[PDB]
Ligand binder design. Sequence first.
Ligand SMILES: [Ca+2]
Ligand SMILES: [Ca+2]
Ligand SMILES: [Ca+2]
Ligand SMILES: [Ca+2]
Ligand SMILES: [Ca+2]
Ligand SMILES: [Ca+2]
Ligand SMILES: [Ca+2]
Ligand SMILES: [Ca+2]
Ligand SMILES: [Ca+2]
Ligand SMILES: [Ca+2]
Ligand SMILES: [Ca+2]
Ligand SMILES: [Ca+2]
Ligand SMILES: [Ca+2]
Ligand SMILES: [Ca+2]
Ligand SMILES: [Ca+2]
Ligand SMILES: [Ca+2]
Ligand SMILES: [Ca+2]
Ligand SMILES: [Ca+2]
Ligand SMILES: [Ca+2]
Ligand SMILES: [Ca+2]
Ligand SMILES: [Ca+2]
Ligand SMILES: [Ca+2]
Ligand SMILES: [Ca+2]
Ligand SMILES: [Ca+2]
Lengths: 222, 222, 222, 222, 222, 222, 222, 222
Amino acid sequence: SRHVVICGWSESTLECLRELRGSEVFVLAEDENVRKKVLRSGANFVHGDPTRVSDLEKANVRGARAVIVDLESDSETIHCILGIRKIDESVRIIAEAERYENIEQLRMAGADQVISPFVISGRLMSRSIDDGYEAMFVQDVLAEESTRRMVEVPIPEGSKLEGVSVLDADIHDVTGVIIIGVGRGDELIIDPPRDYSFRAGDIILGIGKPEEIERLKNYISA
Amino acid sequence: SRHVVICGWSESTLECLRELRGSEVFVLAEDENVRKKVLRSGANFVHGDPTRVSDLEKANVRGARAVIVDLESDSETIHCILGIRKIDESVRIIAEAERYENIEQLRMAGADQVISPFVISGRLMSRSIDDGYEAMFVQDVLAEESTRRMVEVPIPEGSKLEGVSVLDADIHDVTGVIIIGVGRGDELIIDPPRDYSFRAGDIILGIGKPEEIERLKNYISA
Amino acid sequence: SRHVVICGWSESTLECLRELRGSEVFVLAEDENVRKKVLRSGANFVHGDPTRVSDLEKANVRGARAVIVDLESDSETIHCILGIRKIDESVRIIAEAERYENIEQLRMAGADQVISPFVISGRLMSRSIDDGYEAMFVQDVLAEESTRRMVEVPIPEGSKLEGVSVLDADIHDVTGVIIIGVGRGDELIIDPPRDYSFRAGDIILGIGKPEEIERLKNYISA
Amino acid sequence: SRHVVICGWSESTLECLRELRGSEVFVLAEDENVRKKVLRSGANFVHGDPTRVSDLEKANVRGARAVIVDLESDSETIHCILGIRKIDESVRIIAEAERYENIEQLRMAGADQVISPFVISGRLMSRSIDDGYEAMFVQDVLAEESTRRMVEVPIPEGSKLEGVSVLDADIHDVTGVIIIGVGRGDELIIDPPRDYSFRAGDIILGIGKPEEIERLKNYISA
Amino acid sequence: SRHVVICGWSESTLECLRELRGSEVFVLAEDENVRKKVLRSGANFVHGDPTRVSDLEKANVRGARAVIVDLESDSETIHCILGIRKIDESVRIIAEAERYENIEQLRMAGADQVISPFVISGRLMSRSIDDGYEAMFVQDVLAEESTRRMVEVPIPEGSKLEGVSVLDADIHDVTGVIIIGVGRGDELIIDPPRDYSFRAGDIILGIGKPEEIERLKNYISA
Amino acid sequence: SRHVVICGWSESTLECLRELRGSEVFVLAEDENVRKKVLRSGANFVHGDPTRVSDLEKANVRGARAVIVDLESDSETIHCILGIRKIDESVRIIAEAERYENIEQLRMAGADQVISPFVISGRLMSRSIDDGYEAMFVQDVLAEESTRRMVEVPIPEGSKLEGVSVLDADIHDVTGVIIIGVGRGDELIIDPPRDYSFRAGDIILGIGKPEEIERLKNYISA
Amino acid sequence: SRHVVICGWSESTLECLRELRGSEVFVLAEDENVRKKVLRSGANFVHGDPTRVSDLEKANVRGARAVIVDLESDSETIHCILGIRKIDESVRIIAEAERYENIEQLRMAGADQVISPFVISGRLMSRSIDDGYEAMFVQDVLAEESTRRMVEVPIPEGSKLEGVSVLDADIHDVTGVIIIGVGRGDELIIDPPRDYSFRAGDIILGIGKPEEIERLKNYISA
Amino acid sequence: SRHVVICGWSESTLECLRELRGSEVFVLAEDENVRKKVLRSGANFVHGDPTRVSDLEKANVRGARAVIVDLESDSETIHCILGIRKIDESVRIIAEAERYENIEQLRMAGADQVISPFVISGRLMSRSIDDGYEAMFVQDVLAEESTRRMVEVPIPEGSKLEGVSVLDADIHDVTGVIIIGVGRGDELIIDPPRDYSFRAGDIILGIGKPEEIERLKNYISA
Ligand SMILES: [Ca+2]
Ligand SMILES: [Ca+2]
Ligand SMILES: [Ca+2]
Ligand SMILES: [Ca+2]
Ligand SMILES: [Ca+2]
Ligand SMILES: [Ca+2]
Ligand SMILES: [Ca+2]
Ligand SMILES: [Ca+2]
Ligand SMILES: [Ca+2]
Ligand SMILES: [Ca+2]
Ligand SMILES: [Ca+2]
Ligand SMILES: [Ca+2]
Ligand SMILES: [Ca+2]
Ligand SMILES: [Ca+2]
Ligand SMILES: [Ca+2]
Ligand SMILES: [Ca+2]
Ligand SMILES: [Ca+2]
Ligand SMILES: [Ca+2]
Ligand SMILES: [Ca+2]
Ligand SMILES: [Ca+2]
Ligand SMILES: [Ca+2]
Ligand SMILES: [Ca+2]
Ligand SMILES: [Ca+2]
Ligand SMILES: [Ca+2]
């Protein structure tokens, strides 16, 4: 599609940039000694301060399709998001919250998806005292190397599933995928109850083998 | 149960300490200026250096039921795990990996489970460009504020589900809990196929409402 | 009326505190060695961090009539403003902008008015090269020691001036105050034209002697 | 004309440098890491220590038409003003006070103008608790982007208004310019009373549209 | 006598406080970490900033008999001398000059005597290349451990030496004290010639043993 | 004569370097930004660390006639003095003691003349509370601009003054110079008693006009 | 021969680099400000992070004949040794321990030698309280400037001393070399008892004059 | 006998303190948070600065039998040694040199023996490239756990060995200790030649079993 802009350089945006090989990525960071490791990862580098609007317009934030913001603290991640909202009001911003209490401020400044790593990791430790199958499930469906891949299929308009119930559909019996949640717009419903009825435009978040996913796109098609 | 020792003090172990209320936690850290924040959360403080084998013995690593290791670097986390396996050879170690390439060296040193947050947050930011439900699923089932919970139920000895296959048991149709994976020992099989046979001592990893969980524990009992 | 919260301590808010003798003022700042200066100037002190919602609600932001934000940098002034807009979405926030390009990003954060002193003083030093009356005017009308004081008068309901234009009103000839501007809501018309007709509820900004103000309040009466 | 020497670099002298495009400006400061941004702003840089008289004579203080002094503290601004009066006893110094207390000492040292930003900011914060129209008047007439501009028109020798009082003058009706003060030398009379007569050589401080100001200059013509 | 105020804390004021035992000394400084070392030497501590007029007014500058000023820079010393002359117009000020070119400005700002240590040390280091007796003389007559002392004896009213010339009086031959200079008011005449006439109220600066000082004080009495 | 080496750069060595114009001075300092001010003062610059023996052997310490050592602290001054004494055991070193208690250590390390500026300044402050003629004498006889110059004349072998006593000589009656001290070798006797007898090779430290110094050089000659 | 890789830069690896003149040495360290002194020492510099396996493979660890690892702490030395054993499982690692406790962990990680300086220093301090001859023996046989040198002469296959005991050998009388130990593999027998017989392939650790050592090699000849 | 003072706290003196269990040790260091480590290891603590003569005499340097100096840098180790040589000119000072070029400048300061650990460890890492027996010998004979201990025996007065050469003595063939060196006073002859005749008072340095030492002390008897 279009290009992706990454403001700030940390260990989170490094691992993001491995799964973005084949897209056109511009990285915006203040330290000049990080120019080599960015250019090794297949991403163009732009030297500047990410909080400044004049250095943001270097990195093509206007036409971009997503802007991934991970600066050093949350004071600068909020200040960098509002600089982006001054340029383009409709671009999709994915922040990253260092502390827990700054998740609600980061949504008010304009971020469409706040991903806090230290709360996800902090809750996978205390759920792995007794038995650690929760921390093995989170770190195996996100990797693009395992056998079971967590995908998102949209329900087309003109589908055979418009208006049908879930128990009337029974998608795990026919396709082999596990419907862990159906989301509409900006909301996601984990474990949809039986009286939930599909609509065209909803997103079925599922887990399965890539053969079982190709059977699902035939089941929702016209 | 026995107590839980936390080596190091950062934002990951701060969120682990909020979920360890009620149990007994010792936090072992270098600074004298962190004593006020550990005592405010409900955990006794042990001033020391976690890389030393002598100061680990102050924090009662022997009688622990799990040790949670998160120091400033990856090199100090590898050293602190070797210090624990010098003391006790069967205690459980949960460690935090900063770089991706030190996951194989943190497990060889003796960590029973390695939780890498910057790989998790890196893979969620690359997946939330198009639509962010992969970041919303992982951040809601781990929080103790949602409706659906991700829990681990064991198969007791002499159950009704001894030897029974998955397509015959129908855990999702009878109980209504979503079965995302079945765990045995230290391996997890996400989306078990139709030929999978349940055994005694297995761990079922499931997502459902708390009322749905009560129907599962009554279903797999003896 | 109610109290006033001042977030952060600097030379801007120190001059704000002298003009607020008589009311009740809470000052919230991170240093503990600013305590003896604040209690000597007539205001209660609250030790805390102005960017944390836990220590903003200790200083009673909830029922305040205005909260005055002036922190060390513009990264934290945008953070402290969103911390107030999470607590109360209707309180009045007055912020001080250090630099010029952060004025639009401090209004998007939620500040009701942004006072940039280094843009005011930067433009008064440029206008004082030839003859210095621009800096003598601004620094005299705000000081409450001089004869001519710059006050605002609100137009009450059903006044004699309702619906009349300023050309037919002739405020300077019958009252003697100098109407430099008249504002409705959050806009202001400095030097309003002759085609401007007054309305009920407007705030008339004028400069004059205090004897001329009491002549005007009885002239704008209903 | 002649040049303008700026001693010290801060945020106030940066905004002063924007309005001095078209003049020749020598900036004299101690930081070497500010050489690029001064030369970006269209100003020749002269490295030195501004408190030292051997370095002030580098930057051509003698042939200056104004010296704008704003150093890091108030102690160095008094020392930099004492150094200038040793070189030229008649050059125009525009200072900047940090504290309120030093305005009487920065003017006894020799500065012909003291523009304190933290007192104009401190009195516009506490005048914006109720309704912020005083701050919207100060920050709108100083910018060279609004419609109304605060100008200074001098009275020529032999004018049509030589000797007449302001009440018989009727400046706001024939021209439209709001007359906020009349200045003679270094004394400004805000809201001149009706007994005040004009004199030859007076400087009129007015606010109006640019087409009204050209009506004002031709009305006071000889 | 009255007390002695010391503004600033460095090595010069430390040796001055070592030789001011018995009298009452207040030391006015910025740091809170100098209180133990001021209190260990026998001087009460007044925490403040000496550039402020109020914190100078705390330390009883009005009733002092001399104020000793040695701050971190020369600009702060000039500002502190201006503050003391703002408070009291007749107290004695002794100040330390760091650079040679600020002696004229420290005397013009109001110091009654300026003692420049780095000029003294530079001249003694330039004079001790060939043979170092100048440094030994200046460091030897000022210490309170030698045999010979450098003291000032006044000429009382109606003395035996009223009106008498130097070649007639023979202070070195009768008494045995070395007369290096005779001082009147604020001027010193080192090596007065043969035509010099003593007057009442003069100050004789002499070097000699204490018994020779007793003989001189008995010689110039009435 | 030969050349002079100055280790370190401070105000003391600068004021020393003003009085050494006409000699060949090498300055050794670690900061590279001081090359301009050294090259302005007529002294060649050598970049290096003055504590190192190789960077000392760069700066020609072997053939030098005096080495003037003023580094940042006293530890580095002692270390540089021992580094010099490793190279040449017989070169004359003039140190500079920052604190009082390091004078004996600087003498044991190898310095031939320790000049502490801060002790001289502290004693001249404490002796100038009442009347300030001692500071005027000390700062007036060292300058090479006043009328009375403190010189050192050697007694030649074959003089008319070999073996004569002071009271038999009476040098102030014949020449006009004031014998403030006669020194032999490394010792100096201030105010020589009457039974002191001259020897050939002694140094007469005197104060007087240069014509009186010429008359003294004729009086001690053969 | 092949090259030698030095990981980390400190004072120990600087003195090791002096005795490796004639070899090809690659230094791998993180500081860029050490590039000049490494290239002064005759060693190629390879910038990188030595704890990272992608940067150890830069410096050619695979084809090395020894790797000398000495990083800033003991935690990084264990991590750097674990990284090397992943690359080459048979290369010779010489480490350096900071604490005493980590010698058993630095050898279990894979180092074939651990040379702890702070334990050799700590036992030579407390053996030099009475008479310091043990410290004068350690620091004199290691330098390549004294007359006696500690050498290692191997026993050739088929020697004249194959199978004889040391008591019948009489090495100190025919050669003069003091035999302080005989080593087989990684075990050294200090002061071998008279029942110890020589074997083919043994390595003799001896001390002697260089003319005595050539007498020793020809005496153990085949 | 008497006590031992240790100036400064580091890992060298920590290993010195373990070997000095049983005697009385004072440790003098600037940090107060090293207090709990020192009292736990068996030594009294004295808070102070090791470079000041006031706080060296608090730790009883006067009557000590050896003072062990190891500070943070070589500038302060030379300063602390001269501070001891001002107090007692006959006490024994053992210093640790950080760098190599400061060994000669640490002996001129007055240290009786200088132990450079980074030269010992730097030369052991260079000799362990081919085969590592030089580092195994030095680290084994100093450790008091092994069989062969390196001790010194003094030759008493009137011994059987007085006047005999080492070729006629045959210490190794009779007693069985390995005479690596024999020192008179402050020199040492490692591998003494056959023309060396013994004298009364010499210190014989030998390596052997503890049973061989008691065989030697009865052989060197008188
Ligand atoms: Ca981050
Ligand atoms: Ca679990
Ligand atoms: Ca399946
Ligand atoms: Ca972490
Ligand atoms: Ca997605
Ligand atoms: Ca369900
Ligand atoms: Ca501010
Ligand atoms: Ca103007
Ligand atoms: Ca008026
Ligand atoms: Ca300023
Ligand atoms: Ca108002
Ligand atoms: Ca108008
Ligand atoms: Ca000073
Ligand atoms: Ca001289
Ligand atoms: Ca005398
Ligand atoms: Ca100095
Ligand atoms: Ca005096
Ligand atoms: Ca004379
Ligand atoms: Ca080291
Ligand atoms: Ca010994
Ligand atoms: Ca021999
Ligand atoms: Ca050390
Ligand atoms: Ca070898
Ligand atoms: Ca033996």
